[PDB]
């Protein structure tokens, strides 16, 4: 809850950041 | 071609060039 | 990997001042150290 | 106000009578239905199992979806205009 | 002994959404005589009313997220 | 004494299951085709990032818009991690404290660091507002320097009290449903307050805005 | 055991929602215009009929798929069961 | 003790309720300098204050229950 | 003990209707605004205010009715 | 102890007029702008703030009320 | 604990001067727009003001007032 | 005596947000009637309301680290 | 003991600085819509721009003067 | 017993700093509506805001230093 300690999700969220930099690249024009 | 053709087919009249040319 | 090259460009333009998660490593490494502490106290 | 206590009352004349001619098409369902009664034990077994919990804001978090659907036959032609 | 300073911690933590209650009581009163001025409701004069809204409610129930911690 | 109210006292838990797989979960709800003509459900997700890269645009306007292909990355991961949470039993990352600190800290301190590498005096000029009157310079700039240094903290902690905040409503509103065993009547009006407070927590994509958008007038500002 | 799983997605994409273009696969892409929504349409009643163009029953099974998935990890947790069953 | 502290949680707790109180204070008193400048009267503009008087005293009879939650 | 707790808390529950008056004095100084613009006093301006002061101050007694029962 | 409840009750009931002393602030507040457009001052626009005034300011003295109550 | 209620009922009653200190920055910011208007200022424009100021003071007055007599 | 005056202690400090609850009602509740008179919000008109959001939410949980920072 | 009603009430003293902090911003907000009509700054507005700034302050720290009382 | 009035006597005295929270919503929303009716900004509209925000922020950070000195 009050939850502790942080060594957990911080370095997940930055691989996460390769996946929606690929996805979103690819996108078109009007 | 078709309607659906293709996305590098349509790139030869239809521009692209390199980073940062598209202002808006 | 091809997870690079695709967004290599991207990278050392604006990571010169977006990969400063040194900050973040001293505020969270520092941050580590207090919770540490005062379970070793009780 | 007055007349809109019975708008929703006239909704009540409404949605009985709905029901009843909803009614009416499993009443049509009385001799060729073969689908539901297979599968709905496993529903009424795991349900004698562990499923209740505070969880009733599982259905209306699924009964708000189902409102989006009447506008997603709005959807399609905001979709196949392009 | 603790179970009543569960209470008023508790207690006195709900009236700091006392702000918000008035809070959107100016953006709903304020935006009718933005409105009578100017009868364009469908632009963005209305979509100014609800994320001032929300603005003003995210300011509002986390200040009864407090409460509950104290709590439980 | 008619309609006496129930509750019920359950701890409400926020545990910390394995989370690498449900960070990477809301990355494969959008697809990208190597088509033209599209599958009208990609088609209606195209049109929606063209409406608002047209407003993270419009303000810079500098050679500072190549930063911005980056901000409409940041606005659907927590657009949807918040908005898949709201399931019968989800569990959303923006909930814990942890990532919302390194959320902000590395991009807002890209940002004072952007005019330092190229401006180098007037970035934090900028603490000079006008043309200086005598009695005010020291309590001006202890005011604007302590107004700077709250923004990471300003940034990230506004996003992570609200978005629980609306779970426990969810809980607490939905769980005195279950144990509303005495007088049936009233169970209907707690139901009716939830569905419309589910409508009110789609303001979880409302809060994507105040992100995004004060990360540009955090980043316009400055440069 | 990657291309186990790459070989699952797409195969609950290009036949339930919903089959791309890109010529080499024009005809797999009206393939996708007819949909097999139709197949998909009869697990729910009828009512979701709106998956025409915004299609419903193709993006309404994994998030189906996802809460069921996060059944299993509270159940541990919220027990609450007697030396019986329910009603 | 018991009695003791569960009443300085209810009564500090209805001081939230009369905190929106001074919101339709403004909502139903902005009408006023609309109505005068516009007289478009069963228009939007008497329903935009339902919005507002009805949202504002939706913040009023929030704590409300949070007292009678304490109560008990 | 119950004695301390009675009086505390009746008269932590008069504080809200220092919210009431805040805003009762907006709904007659938009009125003061509101004919000296367009003298429309007689007709349904004034009649507003009658309602403006009816509506607030009920959300303002009702905090006096709950101090009456921590009193009682 | 038991003459402690007296004392904490009116200090904290005392506060429900801190509100109504600024409710009569702003009707004051308008005259000053109402006048200011439309010299018609003697006439309805000056006798309707004096009602303004004593309406509020009861309001706010029948809170010090229950203060003496409390305190006797 | 003779002396500890003494100090809650002068800590708790000085707070309601906090609100008729709002009011006075109304009345004297409502004098800076009225005369922007008109420049009849020597008149009775600026002479409401000091109607107004006395007036609201003298509530907040009557606030601090109980806090020397419930104090002694 | 130590966890049960914090209990009570962060509970007075929970309402600093009160006035940012509030204060970010009024300046989003004066775009809505400055983008009515005059159609130029795309420029410095709504870039001043989240300035004016940044400089007035940086106090709301400005005083709520304080109630984290007594209680743990 | 005795420094434990003196710790509470220099806190609950000092919450009256609030209600000045409201009332000065309206001073310094006003003459921003005051002089933005009529561009005559160096004449008497700018002259009672000070003269309300300071007259709301010596509602501020008059509590404050008290509040330093208490603890001495 | 000597620290737990230390905690409970910052608890109230940081709520002075909610009145430099809605007393900052106006004088930076008065840059909203007379910013429109004028474009001279660069001239002393925006200086008399950055006093009005400074010095309204003076009396913020002033009832924040008194929950240090009075822990210290």
């Given at each position: 809850?009050?939850?502790?300690?942080?060594?957990?999700?911080?370095?997940?969220?930055?691989?996460?950041?390769?996946?929606?930099?690929?996805?979103?690249?690819?996108?078109?024009?009007? | 071609?078709?309607?659906?053709?293709?996305?590098?087919?349509?790139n030869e009249?239809?521009p692209?060039?390199?980073?940062?040319?598209?202002?808006? | 990997?091809?997870?690079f090259?695709?967004?290599?460009?991207?990278?050392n333009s604006?990571?010169?001042?977006?990969?400063?998660?040194?900050?973040?490593?001293?505020?969270?490494?520092?941050?580590?150290?207090?919770?540490?502490?005062?379970?070793r106290?009780? | 106000?007055?007349?809109?206590e019975?708008?929703?009352?006239v909704?009540?004349?409404?949605?009985?009578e709905?029901?009843?001619?909803?009614?009416?098409?499993?009443?049509?369902?009385t001799?060729?239905?073969?689908?539901?009664?297979?599968?709905?034990?496993?529903?009424?077994?795991?349900?004698?199992?562990?499923?209740?919990?505070?969880?009733?804001?599982?259905?209306?978090?699924?009964?708000?979806?189902?409102?989006?659907?009447?506008?997603?036959?709005?959807?399609?032609?905001?979709?196949?205009?392009? | 002994?603790?179970?009543?300073?569960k209470?008023?911690?508790?207690?006195?933590?709900?009236?700091?959404?006392?702000?918000?209650?008035?809070?959107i009581?100016?953006?709903?009163?304020?935006?009718?005589?933005?409105?009578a001025?100017?009868?364009?409701?469908?632009?963005?004069?209305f979509?100014?009313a609800?994320?001032?809204?929300?603005?003003?409610?995210?300011?509002?129930?986390?200040?009864?997220?407090?409460?509950?911690?104290?709590?439980? | 004494?008619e309609?006496?109210f129930?509750?019920?006292?359950a701890?409400?838990?926020?545990?910390?299951?394995?989370?690498?797989?449900?960070?990477?979960?809301?990355?494969?709800?959008?697809?990208?085709?190597?088509?033209?003509?599209?599958?009208?459900?990609?088609?209606?997700?195209?049109?929606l990032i063209?409406?608002?890269?047209?407003?993270?645009?419009?303000?810079?306007?500098?050679?500072?818009q190549?930063?911005?292909?980056?901000?409409?990355?940041?606005?659907?991961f927590?657009?949807?991690?918040?908005?898949?949470?709201?399931?019968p039993?989800?569990?959303?990352?923006?909930?814990?404290?942890?990532?919302?600190?390194?959320?902000?800290?590395?991009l807002?301190?890209a940002?004072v660091?952007?005019g330092?590498?190229?401006?180098?005096?007037?970035?934090?000029?900028?603490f000079?507002?006008?043309?200086?009157?005598?009695?005010?310079?020291?309590?001006?700039?202890?005011?604007?320097?302590?107004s700077?240094?709250i923004?990471?903290?300003?940034?990230?902690?506004?996003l992570?009290?609200?978005?629980?905040?609306?779970?426990?409503?969810?809980?607490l509103?939905?769980?005195?449903?279950?144990?509303?065993?005495?007088?049936?009547?009233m169970?209907?009006?707690?139901?009716?307050?939830?569905?419309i407070?589910?409508?009110?927590?789609?303001?979880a994509?409302?809060?994507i805005?105040?992100?995004?958008?004060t990360?540009?007038?955090?980043?316009?500002?400055?440069? | 055991?990657?291309?186990?799983?790459?070989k699952?997605?797409?195969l609950?994409?290009?036949?339930?929602?919903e089959?791309p273009?890109?010529?080499?696969?024009?005809?797999?892409?009206?393939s996708?215009?007819?949909?097999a929504?139709?197949?998909?349409?009869?697990?729910?009643?009828?009512?979701?009929?709106?998956?025409?163009?915004?299609s419903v029953?193709?993006?309404?099974?994994?998030?189906?798929?996802?809460?069921?998935?996060n059944?299993?990890?509270?159940?541990?947790?919220?027990?609450?069961?007697?030396?019986?069953?329910?009603?």
């Amino acid at each position: 809850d009050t939850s502790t300690w942080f060594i957990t999700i911080t370095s997940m969220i930055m691989t996460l950041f390769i996946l929606f930099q690929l996805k979103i690249s690819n996108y078109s024009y009007p | 071609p078709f309607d659906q053709m293709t996305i590098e087919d349509l790139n030869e009249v239809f521009p692209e060039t390199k980073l940062d040319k598209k202002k808006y | 990997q091809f997870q690079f090259t695709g967004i290599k460009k991207y990278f050392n333009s604006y990571t010169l001042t977006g990969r400063m998660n040194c900050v973040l490593a001293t505020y969270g490494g520092i941050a580590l150290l207090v919770l540490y502490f005062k379970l070793r106290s009780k | 106000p007055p007349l809109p206590e019975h708008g929703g009352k006239v909704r009540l004349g409404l949605i009985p009578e709905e029901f009843f001619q909803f009614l009416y098409p499993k009443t049509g369902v009385t001799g060729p239905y073969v689908l539901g009664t297979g599968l709905i034990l496993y529903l009424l077994s795991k349900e004698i199992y562990v499923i209740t919990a505070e969880t009733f804001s599982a259905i209306s978090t699924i009964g708000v979806l189902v409102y989006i659907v009447k506008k997603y036959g709005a959807s399609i032609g905001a979709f196949a205009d392009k | 002994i603790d179970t009543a300073a569960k209470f008023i911690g508790a207690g006195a933590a709900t009236v700091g959404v006392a702000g918000s209650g008035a809070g959107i009581g100016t953006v709903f009163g304020s935006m009718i005589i933005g409105y009578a001025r100017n009868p364009s409701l469908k632009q963005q004069l209305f979509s100014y009313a609800i994320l001032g809204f929300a603005l003003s409610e995210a300011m509002g129930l986390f200040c009864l997220m407090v409460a509950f911690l104290i709590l439980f | 004494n008619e309609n006496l109210f129930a509750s019920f006292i359950a701890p409400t838990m926020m545990g910390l299951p394995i989370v690498t797989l449900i960070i990477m979960f809301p990355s494969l709800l959008f697809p990208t085709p190597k088509r033209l003509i599209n599958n009208r459900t990609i088609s209606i997700q195209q049109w929606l990032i063209q409406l608002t890269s047209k407003q993270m645009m419009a303000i810079h306007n500098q050679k500072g818009q190549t930063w911005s292909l980056m901000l409409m990355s940041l606005i659907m991961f927590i657009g949807s991690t918040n908005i898949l949470g709201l399931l019968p039993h989800s569990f959303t990352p923006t909930t814990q404290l942890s990532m919302n600190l390194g959320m902000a800290i590395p991009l807002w301190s890209a940002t004072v660091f952007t005019g330092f590498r190229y401006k180098t005096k007037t970035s934090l000029a900028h603490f000079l507002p006008q043309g200086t009157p005598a009695l005010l310079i020291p309590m001006l700039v202890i005011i604007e320097t302590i107004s700077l240094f709250i923004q990471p903290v300003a940034l990230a902690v506004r996003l992570t009290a609200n978005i629980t905040a609306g779970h426990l409503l969810i809980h607490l509103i939905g769980g005195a449903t279950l144990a509303l065993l005495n007088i049936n009547t009233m169970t209907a009006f707690i139901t009716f307050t939830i569905l419309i407070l589910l409508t009110i927590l789609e303001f979880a994509v409302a809060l994507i805005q105040a992100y995004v958008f004060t990360l540009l007038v955090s980043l316009y500002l400055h440069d | 055991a990657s291309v186990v799983p790459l070989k699952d997605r797409r195969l609950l994409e290009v036949k339930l929602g919903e089959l791309p273009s890109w010529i080499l696969m024009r005809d797999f892409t009206p393939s996708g215009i007819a949909g097999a929504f139709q197949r998909g349409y009869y697990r729910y009643y009828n009512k979701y009929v709106n998956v025409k163009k915004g299609s419903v029953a193709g993006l309404s099974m994994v998030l189906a798929a996802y809460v069921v998935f996060n059944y299993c990890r509270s159940y541990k947790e919220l027990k609450h069961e007697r030396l019986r069953k329910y009603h």
